[PDB]
Design an enzyme around this catalytic site. Sequence first.
Site, PDB file in Angstrom:
ATOM      1  N   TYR A  88       6.270 -22.036 -28.772  1.00 57.97           N
ATOM      2  CA  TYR A  88       6.349 -23.151 -27.846  1.00 57.97           C
ATOM      3  C   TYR A  88       6.100 -24.465 -28.577  1.00 57.97           C
ATOM      4  O   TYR A  88       5.345 -24.540 -29.550  1.00 57.97           O
ATOM      5  CB  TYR A  88       5.376 -23.006 -26.671  1.00 57.97           C
ATOM      6  CG  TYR A  88       3.904 -23.214 -26.963  1.00 57.97           C
ATOM      7  CD1 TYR A  88       3.099 -22.155 -27.344  1.00 57.97           C
ATOM      8  CD2 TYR A  88       3.308 -24.466 -26.791  1.00 57.97           C
ATOM      9  CE1 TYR A  88       1.749 -22.344 -27.585  1.00 57.97           C
ATOM     10  CE2 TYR A  88       1.969 -24.661 -27.048  1.00 57.97           C
ATOM     11  CZ  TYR A  88       1.193 -23.594 -27.432  1.00 57.97           C
ATOM     12  OH  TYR A  88      -0.143 -23.787 -27.669  1.00 57.97           O
ATOM     13  N   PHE A 124       8.699 -28.578 -22.358  1.00 57.81           N
ATOM     14  CA  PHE A 124       8.390 -27.550 -23.348  1.00 57.81           C
ATOM     15  C   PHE A 124       9.644 -27.053 -24.052  1.00 57.81           C
ATOM     16  O   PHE A 124      10.683 -26.855 -23.414  1.00 57.81           O
ATOM     17  CB  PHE A 124       7.679 -26.365 -22.697  1.00 57.81           C
ATOM     18  CG  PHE A 124       6.297 -26.672 -22.240  1.00 57.81           C
ATOM     19  CD1 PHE A 124       5.250 -26.678 -23.142  1.00 57.81           C
ATOM     20  CD2 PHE A 124       6.040 -26.959 -20.910  1.00 57.81           C
ATOM     21  CE1 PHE A 124       3.972 -26.968 -22.731  1.00 57.81           C
ATOM     22  CE2 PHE A 124       4.758 -27.247 -20.489  1.00 57.81           C
ATOM     23  CZ  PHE A 124       3.723 -27.250 -21.401  1.00 57.81           C
ATOM     24  N   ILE A 168      -0.285 -21.536 -17.698  1.00 55.23           N
ATOM     25  CA  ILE A 168       0.012 -22.171 -16.421  1.00 55.23           C
ATOM     26  C   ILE A 168       1.100 -21.400 -15.694  1.00 55.23           C
ATOM     27  O   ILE A 168       1.799 -20.569 -16.284  1.00 55.23           O
ATOM     28  CB  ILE A 168       0.449 -23.631 -16.620  1.00 55.23           C
ATOM     29  CG1 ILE A 168       1.721 -23.654 -17.466  1.00 55.23           C
ATOM     30  CG2 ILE A 168      -0.659 -24.435 -17.272  1.00 55.23           C
ATOM     31  CD1 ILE A 168       2.445 -24.955 -17.501  1.00 55.23           C
ATOM     32  N   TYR A 172      -0.907 -29.742 -14.441  1.00 53.88           N
ATOM     33  CA  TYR A 172      -1.967 -30.747 -14.449  1.00 53.88           C
ATOM     34  C   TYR A 172      -1.689 -31.921 -13.519  1.00 53.88           C
ATOM     35  O   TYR A 172      -2.087 -33.049 -13.837  1.00 53.88           O
ATOM     36  CB  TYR A 172      -2.217 -31.290 -15.870  1.00 53.88           C
ATOM     37  CG  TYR A 172      -2.759 -30.262 -16.841  1.00 53.88           C
ATOM     38  CD1 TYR A 172      -4.087 -29.857 -16.789  1.00 53.88           C
ATOM     39  CD2 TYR A 172      -1.938 -29.695 -17.810  1.00 53.88           C
ATOM     40  CE1 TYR A 172      -4.581 -28.911 -17.671  1.00 53.88           C
ATOM     41  CE2 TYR A 172      -2.422 -28.752 -18.698  1.00 53.88           C
ATOM     42  CZ  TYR A 172      -3.741 -28.364 -18.625  1.00 53.88           C
ATOM     43  OH  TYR A 172      -4.219 -27.426 -19.510  1.00 53.88           O
ATOM     44  N   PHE A 218       2.508 -33.010 -27.237  1.00 52.30           N
ATOM     45  CA  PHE A 218       1.073 -32.868 -27.030  1.00 52.30           C
ATOM     46  C   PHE A 218       0.514 -31.545 -27.519  1.00 52.30           C
ATOM     47  O   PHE A 218      -0.699 -31.457 -27.732  1.00 52.30           O
ATOM     48  CB  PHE A 218       0.707 -33.056 -25.548  1.00 52.30           C
ATOM     49  CG  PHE A 218       1.227 -31.978 -24.643  1.00 52.30           C
ATOM     50  CD1 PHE A 218       2.518 -32.044 -24.143  1.00 52.30           C
ATOM     51  CD2 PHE A 218       0.406 -30.927 -24.243  1.00 52.30           C
ATOM     52  CE1 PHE A 218       3.001 -31.066 -23.302  1.00 52.30           C
ATOM     53  CE2 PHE A 218       0.882 -29.945 -23.402  1.00 52.30           C
ATOM     54  CZ  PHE A 218       2.182 -30.018 -22.926  1.00 52.30           C
ATOM     55  N   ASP A 219       1.338 -30.518 -27.705  1.00 53.38           N
ATOM     56  CA  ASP A 219       0.864 -29.236 -28.200  1.00 53.38           C
ATOM     57  C   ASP A 219       2.052 -28.511 -28.808  1.00 53.38           C
ATOM     58  O   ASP A 219       3.180 -28.678 -28.347  1.00 53.38           O
ATOM     59  CB  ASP A 219       0.234 -28.403 -27.077  1.00 53.38           C
ATOM     60  CG  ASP A 219      -0.623 -27.267 -27.599  1.00 53.38           C
ATOM     61  OD1 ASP A 219      -0.721 -27.095 -28.832  1.00 53.38           O
ATOM     62  OD2 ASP A 219      -1.212 -26.548 -26.768  1.00 53.38           O
TER      63      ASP A 219
END
Length: 107
Positions: free
Chosen positions: A26, A99, A56, A82, A36-37
């Site tokens: 991912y 994503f 999630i 979120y 962000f990730d």
Amino acid sequence: GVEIETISPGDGRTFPKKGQTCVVHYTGMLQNGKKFDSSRDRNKPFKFRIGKQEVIKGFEEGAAQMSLGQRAKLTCTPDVAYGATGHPGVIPPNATLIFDVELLNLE
């Protein structure tokens, strides 16, 4: 809300099922924003299992809708990750998360 946008290579048949530790390249993204990730950064593609609500609902539902080899592209809504809560400093409240999901899984 999970809308799947698959970059075509894959097999289309090997779905992750319940309790199966599955492996995802991912690469997260903020809408109108930067990353962000990323499991591509840490280079451990996040050997997580299905059915424990570890991830999630925007990504757990996306994993069963994908198969081995498939390279989808998530669009997670606010209310799946979120939207109400929001993470401090990282992912704000009311956030529509993006994503780069590639399912090269195990089990």
